[PDB]
Design a binder for this molecule. Structure first.
Ligand code: 1LD
Ligand code: 1LD
Ligand code: FE2
Ligand code: FE2
Lengths: 413, 411
């Protein structure tokens, strides 16, 4: 299949992309606009990018907001209580139906790579069973990674170490954790030691809910980064949230950055989720509660944005559109400078792909899989400013989604 | 013209809206999802609302981002510097062309009511002249209100008082102000006294940029509210921004609220603008810098949301879509409760209309102007969740915008 008149990120020239056998066969700069022969897609000067990535979402909990009760306080902790209640009625088929519906939303907005956390603090591991099957069933739309996520703690929940182990042995791709939620500081530390041992023993990736709390004493990130560094696993390890970093002592944080850089770990921020869940224990002034995204990025540290929740016990909105999350993140993290906006798509594509260790299975380069979108915009700035629609989504060389370009009529002239 | 099968806000019932001679002739409850007759518009269970309002925007500065230099710090103060530079080459034609294009964006997203601030710290009053003209020219799309806004201060700029007076004489609807930017506290206070005298003498509305700064000592709001209360002009008065309130001592703020309630003034918050401009002088933790929107609303005080800027020396983004602003404000102000979401369109429709004193010229009631939208959603919650598109905009009983319903194909 041929795509002509396509823009590529941060370049002026138009390109033709030749897709064959499910991979990108050739990419070639054109002289100017050209005409689509039969069986050629004309991108019409629109941007072609690799697919959006959703590197952190809770598909087991998606679409359960209000069941059986609402999170009245809007806090992380009440959300956990509400989820605990909903867990009483989770079945594999219930999980499957909700997850597939949310996957449809992600697909509608150009997401082809998803990393989902699944709560394994449930002796039945019902949601895990369902999502391991969804991974197979939904492969025509997405590549799904599954994180074994001990929502109620590893050290603090009955048989927590055993449940994490079962989940990894069943084939969860990523080992999770929640050290700030363990009952004591010492158990928070030992949970990190366990999960890293587990990840290393089974050769899995790591993605830990790390310091998702406004307490400036929540410093489990240093433990994770140092284990990553010592074990030589940096690239395989992601720290999600790190909200407490947004409240750290600045002298400590400056020291910390040396280790963060040295460890080579990745960071995920969920700005719409954290703006909603953080700052709840302040009066006024009210902190933003988001990690230091701009600063990590300027230090050469890989950071990206994620939606986290869609209509679940923690977050009542969500429609699958990662560009809305990008917009929120640039605002809250003070990244609306000219240079930030010229490359802002990094934070929902390339950086996220690096966090998920997609390697050569991602990106527009000859020889890589033919997975791409055509966006209704010419560049990064216009993409975020207009919240550009995904006009075409192509997966394994096939068109899986097509939108018409919006047309507004003015009947009164 | 007849619209059938329309949802109205916060009800499950279906309605027919009958429009004649530019007004809403009849609103009738239906007993079913009806088959449409040849002439009728079938809303198909979609929500009909009065138009979105943009109660605070700077049209004179719109689409000037980067001219002649960028706001590198992303601060309110550098923004004023860059604007001062851009103002050096502002002309009426320049203002008119940019303002019309942004008005086009606002129209595209269902905005029919707009209050623009115009910088009158300019002895040529170029932008004001242009916008007074645009108010008439663009009346087929929007009802525009103009605020005489002394960007560089009243007491603090050469002939500031005389320029404010001249701007009002020329026909500005609203008297503006910027007390926290005056050079001393005492001059901030005197500027409020002057601007209230000016508004009261010429019978104009008031809308002040009030305490747009993270300084907890910035307390001009109390002076503004007290003057409003004493003069009996609360309903005519609006305080825009009030970012400092998000940093006030809490005992003081609790006391202040009694005055805010008694004064009857309105509040406008610009969440995307403030999240961008505020908190710049903190390290960590970093404050939100937005006023106490949820608290004002719970105290029965009228508050609403606005875009503030579209691609200007203060804010590099913007596309005219007020629903994105609503989204931002609900998140940043911690108003994502179930109850909040069920009525969240208040903050970009009814509340804003109240701030602009639109009265019976606004709202879906018999006898009122046939100005309304059909949104691609059934209720407030879905409208903000999906960022619902405006499918139809009707003004004075005529369709002025039509969008196709989006249809995704899956091959
Ligand atoms: N933000 C969240 N934190 C958690 O620990 N669980 C689920 C969530 F959505
Ligand atoms: N937020 C703003 N404050 C001002 O004083 N001027 C212009 C703006 F856009
Ligand atoms: Fe999460
Ligand atoms: Fe303003």
């Amino acid at each position: 299949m041929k795509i002509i008149n396509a823009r590529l990120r941060r370049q002026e020239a138009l390109f033709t992309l030749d897709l064959q056998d499910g991979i990108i066969h050739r990419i070639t700069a054109q002289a100017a606009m050209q005409t689509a022969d039969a069986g050629a897609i004309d991108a019409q000067g629109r941007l072609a990018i690799p697919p959006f990535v959703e590197p952190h979402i809770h598909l087991d909990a998606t679409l359960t907001a209000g069941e059986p009760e609402w999170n009245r306080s809007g806090t992380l902790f009440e959300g956990i209580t509400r989820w605990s209640q909903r867990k009483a009625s989770i079945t594999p088929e219930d999980t499957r139906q909700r997850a597939l519906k949310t996957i449809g939303m992600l697909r509608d907005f150009g997401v082809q790579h998803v990393r989902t956390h699944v709560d394994v603090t449930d002796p039945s591991l019902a949601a895990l069973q369902a999502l391991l099957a969804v991974k197979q069933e939904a492969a025509d739309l997405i590549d799904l990674q599954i994180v074994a996520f001990p929502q109620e703690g590893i050290e603090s929940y009955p048989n927590g170490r055993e449940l994490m182990t079962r989940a990894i042995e069943m084939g969860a791709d990523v080992v999770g954790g929640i050290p700030h939620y363990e009952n004591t500081r010492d158990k928070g530390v030992s949970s990190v030691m366990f999960l890293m041992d587990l990840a290393q023993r089974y050769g899995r990736l790591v993605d830990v809910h790390c310091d998702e709390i406004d307490d400036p004493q929540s410093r489990f990130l240093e433990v994770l980064a140092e284990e990553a560094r010592v074990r030589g696993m940096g690239a395989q390890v992601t720290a999600s949230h790190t909200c407490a970093m947004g409240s750290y002592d600045n002298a400590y944080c400056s020291k910390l950055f040396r280790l963060l850089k040295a460890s080579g770990i990745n960071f995920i921020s969920c700005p719409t989720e954290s703006i909603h869940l953080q700052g709840r224990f302040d009066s006024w002034p009210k902190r933003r509660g988001v990690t230091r995204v701009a600063e990590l990025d300027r230090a050469g540290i890989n950071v990206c944005f994620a939606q986290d929740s869609i209509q679940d016990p923690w977050y009542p909105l969500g429609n699958g559109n990662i560009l809305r999350i990008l917009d929120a993140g640039l605002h809250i993290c003070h990244m609306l400078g000219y240079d930030d906006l010229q490359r802002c798509l990094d934070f929902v594509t390339d950086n996220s792909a690096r966090a998920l260790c997609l390697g050569d299975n991602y990106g527009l380069a000859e020889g890589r899989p033919a997975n791409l979108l055509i966006l209704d915009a010419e560049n990064d700035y216009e993409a975020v400013r207009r919240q550009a629609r995904v006009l075409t989504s192509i997966r394994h060389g096939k068109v899986i989604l097509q939108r018409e370009v919006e047309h507004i009529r003015y009947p009164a002239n």
